[PDB]
Amino acid sequence: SKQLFDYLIVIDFESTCWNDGKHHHSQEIIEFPAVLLNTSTGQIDSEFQAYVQPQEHPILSEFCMELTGIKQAQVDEGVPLKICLSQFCKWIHKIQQQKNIIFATGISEPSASEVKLCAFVTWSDWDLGVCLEYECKRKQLLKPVFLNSWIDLRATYKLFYRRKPKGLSGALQEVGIEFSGREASGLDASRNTALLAWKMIRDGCVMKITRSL
């Protein structure tokens, strides 16, 4: 089948988290990874990664550092979220000078010309729908407008294969991709989600937008 988007940008945020009985409502991004997937060659053409220095809870709990694999010295070495969106936009602008990529709000037909369509792919509506949305509203930051529509890969998986997977790891195993060990985080989790997305593309899945704000 012919794909609608010529590129996919896969994002899997890591955030502050605790397991200690207390009542936490807000979470802060601590890692911003993204991989540019080529939906016709299956290769990763570019990558972005930044460590976000949390402001509201600057000290990572032991549970968080164990779960995400991020060490305190890395978020201490990182930039605040506002500077992180700036670097992410410069990266988005760089792959546009290189790949001639545009973000369109409602595509009905694939490109037949020199332009290349692109969309963001997440494993859930949590990254761009809850995490970055509430934090941008809470910190009153200017959120890039192209991050308001994305592809929920989990919903796409549930409908293309007609089965509920046991997480992102369970999804990879059910299609023959067997990986063992600790749960991957950050950029490594983004690469694995892109590996899943590319496998679904080869199986005949047409990636379409699932959420709009």
For residue 59, what is the DSSP state? S
- Answer for which of 17, 34, 153, 194 binds ligand AMP (CB under 6 A) is 17
**168 binds a copy of itself per the rule CB under 8 A:** yes
Helix (H) or strand (E) segment spanning residue 98 = helix 81-99
Rounded CA-CA distance 70/14 in Å is: 9
Give the total of residues touching a copy of itself (CB under 8 A): 24
**φ/ψ (deg, to 5) at 35:** -125, 135
Q: Could you tell me how many residues of this chain bind Mn ion (CB under 5 A)?
A: 2
Phi and psi, residue 150, nearest 5°: -150, 175
Nearer to ligand AMP, 117 or 128 (CB): 128
Which residues have C-beta within 8 Å of that of residue 49, sequence separation ≥ 6? Answer: 31, 32, 33, 34, 186, 187
Q: Indicate whether 150 belongs to the interface with Mn ion (CB under 5 A).
A: no
First to last CA, the chain: 28
One residue of 1, 2, 21, 112 binding a copy of itself per CB under 8 A: 21
Q: Which stretch binds a copy of itself (CB under 8 A): 23-31, 32-40, 46-54, 93-101?
A: 23-31
Among 130, 142, 145, 177, binds a copy of itself (CB under 8 A): 130
Q: What is the DSSP letter of 133?
A: H
* Binding partner of 125, given a copy of itself, Mn ion, ligand AMP, none, CB within 5-8 angstroms per partner class: a copy of itself
**Interface residue list for ligand AMP (CB under 6 A):** 12, 14-15, 17-19, 22-25, 27, 67-68, 185, 189
